[PDB]
C-alpha cells in the first residue's frame, strides 16, 4: 500500500524554493560532507534526521502531514546549509527539546564528517514560551544600586584547596577592598576540603561585614552546582535563607533541565543567577565541528541567566573580537540585525526578554582595562581572580587596584578622552594617587596574551 525502500534524503528534505516563515526556527549549519556526498544530500540528511525522517521510507509517514512538519534545507551558500524547522516541531519552553532535535544525532552520521551549528534564528513566537533572565541587567543594577561603570568581580583562588573559613577570609579582603562581587570557581561545589554549607555561611559573614564597612552593596556568587537537581535546589534554598543576593550555576555541566529548575527557584526566591559556561570550549571552539557559542548564548538568555561569561579577547582564554561584539549584542539588545562580519547569520528579535550581563574573565589585569571598557562598555562584569589575589600586597590591595583602574578609565572615557590611545597615561595618572594600582601595573607590565 506504499513505496518501500531507500530514497536520497534530498528528494523530501531539500527544497530550494521554500520561503521561510516568520514562525520557523532557522539553523545555519556548516557541513563537511563525507567525500563524494553532495552538499544537497548532506544538508537534506541533517534536515531529515533532525525532524521527521530516517534512512528508509516508512508506511507510517503517510499517517501524518510531512509537508507541514518536515524540516527542509531551503538554501545553501558555500558549506553553509540553511534549514527551516516548523514551529510545531518544538516543545514550548524547552531548550532540552531544541537540542534533542537540532543537535541530537546529526553530528554523528557517516555521511557528514564534520558539522557545526553556527547560528539559529529563534522566532518570536517560540521565544515567548521562555521566561528569560530572572533579574536582567536593569533590575540587577537597581538591586545593587550601581550605575555608570562596569561591575567588578573575581574568582577566589586557589581554585580548590582552601577551607571554608579561610576561603571567606579571601572573600572579605576582596570585597572590602572594592570588588562588587566575588565568586566560587566553577569546580568548587561541595568537597572534602570545603563543604558547601560551611562555605555559604562564612562567605555571607564576609559579604555582610564588607557591606557594612564600605557602605556599598556586595555579593558573592555561591556555586550551587551539584550532582542532582534536588541538591542544587537545597543549596539555593540555604543561600536565600542567608540573604545572599546571588547564586551561581554551571549551566552546561549541570545541564539545561536542571538549569531551568534553578532559574525558576532563583526567581521565586529573590536570587540573582550567575551562569558559568564550563564545558563550552569542548564543542564551541573548533570552526569545523560543534555548536558556536553565540547559539549557547541565545539558549542561555532564553532559559534565563542574569550573567554569562563571554570571554575577554585579550586574556588567557581564546576569544575572537568580532564574534564577541556580536555575542554581547545578542545578550543585551532588544533586536540584533544579521551581520556576516560578526558571524551573525540571522536577524534576532528578542521578543522583550530581559538582557544578560556579559562577564569578561580569565587572565586579565589592570593593563587590560582600557581595552575591556572599549569592547564592552558599562554593562559588563570584569572579573580579576589571579589579578586580585596575585597583587604584591594580597587581595584587599589587588581589589582596590582593579576598582580604581576601571573607575579611572570610565571617568576618562566620559570626559571625551581616547581610552585606547591614552590608556597607559590614564592608568599612570590614576596610579599617582593609588599605590595599589602602581604596584599592580609594575608587577604585570610585561604579561600579554
Amino acid at each position: 500500500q506504499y513505496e518501500a525502500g531507500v530514497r536520497p534524503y534530498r528528494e523530501t528534505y531539500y527544497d530550494p524554493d521554500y520561503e521561510p516563515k516568520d514562525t520557523d526556527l532557522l539553523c545555519a549549519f556548516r557541513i563537511t560532507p563525507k567525500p563524494g556526498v553532495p552538499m544537497e544530500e548532506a544538508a537534506a540528511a541533517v534536515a531529515a534526521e533532525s525532524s521527521t525522517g530516517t534512512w528508509t521510507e516508512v508506511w507510517s509517514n503517510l499517517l501524518t502531514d510531512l509537508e507541514r512538519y518536515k524540516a527542509r534545507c531551503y538554501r545553501i551558500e558555500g558549506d553553509v546549509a540553511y534549514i527551516a524547522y516548523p514551529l510545531d516541531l518544538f516543545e514550548e519552553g524547552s531548550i532540552v527539546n531544541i537540542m534533542s532535535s537540532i543537535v541530537g544525532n546529526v553530528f554523528g552520521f557517516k555521511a557528514v564528517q564534520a558539522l557545526r551549528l553556527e547560528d539559529m534564528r529563534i522566532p518570536v513566537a517560540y521565544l515567548k514560551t521562555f521566561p528569560g533572565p530572572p533579574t536582567g541587567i536593569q533590575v540587577e543594577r537597581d538591586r545593587l544600586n550601581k550605575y555608570g561603570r562596569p561591575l567588578l568581580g573575581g574568582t577566589i583562588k586557589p581554585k580548590l584547596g582552601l577551607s571554608a573559613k579561610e576561603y571567606a577570609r579571601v572573600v572579605y579582603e576582596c570585597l572590602r577592598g572594592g570588588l562588587d562581587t566575588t565568586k566560587d570557581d566553577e569546580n568548587l561545589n561541595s568537597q572534602p576540603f570545603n563543604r558547601w554549607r560551611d562555605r555559604f555561611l562564612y562567605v555571607m559573614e564576609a559579604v555582610r561585614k564588607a557591606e557594612a564597612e564600605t557602605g556599598e552593596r556586595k555579593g558573592h556568587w555561591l556555586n550551587v552546582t551539584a550532582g542532582s537537581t534536588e541538591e542544587m535546589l537545597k543549596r539555593a534554598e540555604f543561600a536565600a535563607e542567608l540573604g545572599s543576593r546571588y547564586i551561581m550555576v554551571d549551566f552546561l555541566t549541570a545541564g539545561f533541565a536542571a538549569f531551568a529548575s534553578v532559574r525558576r527557584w532563583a526567581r521565586e526566591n529573590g536570587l540573582m543567577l550567575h551562569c558559568h559556561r564550563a564545558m563550552h570550549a569542548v564543542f564551541d571552539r573548533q570552526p569545523n565541528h560543534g555548536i558556536h557559542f553565540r547559539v549557547l548564548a541565545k539558549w542561555l538568555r532564553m532559559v534565563g541567566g542574569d550573567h554569562v561569561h563571554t570571554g575577554t579577547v585579550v586574556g588567557k582564554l581564546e576569544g575572537d573580537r568580532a564574534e564577541t561584539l556580536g555575542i554581547a549584542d545578542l545578550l543585551r539588545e532588544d533586536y540584533v540585525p544579521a551581520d556576516p562580519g560578526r558571524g551573525l547569520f540571522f536577524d534576532q528579535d528578542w521578543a522583550g526578554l530581559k538582557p544578560v550581563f556579559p562577564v569578561a574573565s580569565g587572565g586579565i589585569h589592570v593593563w587590560h582595562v582600557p581595552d575591556l571598557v572599549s569592547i564592552f562598555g558599562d554593562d559588563a562584569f570584569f572579573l580579576f581572580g589571579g589579578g586580585t589575589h596575585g597583587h604584591p600586597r594580597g587581595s584587599r590591595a589587588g581589589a582596590t587596584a582593579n576598582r580604581v583602574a576601571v573607575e579611572a578609565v570610565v571617568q576618562a572615557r566620559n570626559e571625551g578622552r581616547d581610552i585606547l590611545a591614552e590608556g597607559r597615561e590614564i592608568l599612570e595618572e590614576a596610579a599617582r594617587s593609588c599605590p595599589e594600582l602602581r604596584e599592580a601595573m609594575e608587577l604585570w607590565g610585561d604579561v600579554k596574551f
Partner: protein, 102 residues
C-alpha cells in the same frame, strides 16, 4: 562610606563634575540631582532635588541646580544621576558633594 561610581577616585572638582554632566547630556540622557543624610546600602531612594531635569539643555543649568541643592542641604550627600527612558534605567550615578562630617 564609599558612594559607588567614582568613589575610589579623588573627590571630583567642579570642573570634573561638569564633564560628567556634559557626558550625560551629549548622550541624550536626563540629568537629575538627589540628596540624603543616610547614604548607606539600605537606602534605595534618596530625596529628589526637584524633578529630573527633562528640559535641561546645558551643563551650566545642572551645575547651578547642584550649587542650589548644596546651599540648601550642606549636611547631605548630593549625587548626580543620568536616566535613559528608552532602557528605563539609570545610566550614571555618582556623588558630587560630600558633607564636612564625611
Amino acid at each position: 562610606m564609599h558612594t559607588e561610581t567614582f568613589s575610589y577616585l579623588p573627590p571630583l572638582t567642579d570642573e570634573e563634575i561638569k564633564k560628567q554632566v556634559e557626558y550625560i547630556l551629549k548622550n541624550g540622557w536626563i540629568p537629575g540631582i538627589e540628596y540624603t543624610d543616610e547614604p548607606g546600602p539600605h537606602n534605595s531612594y534618596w530625596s529628589f532635588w526637584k524633578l529630573p531635569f527633562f528640559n535641561a539643555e546645558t551643563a551650566e543649568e545642572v551645575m547651578e541646580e547642584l550649587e542650589a541643592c548644596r546651599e540648601a542641604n550642606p549636611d547631605c550627600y548630593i549625587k548626580i544621576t543620568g536616566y535613559d527612558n528608552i532602557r528605563q534605567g539609570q545610566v550614571l550615578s555618582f556623588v558630587a558633594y560630600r558633607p564636612h562630617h564625611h
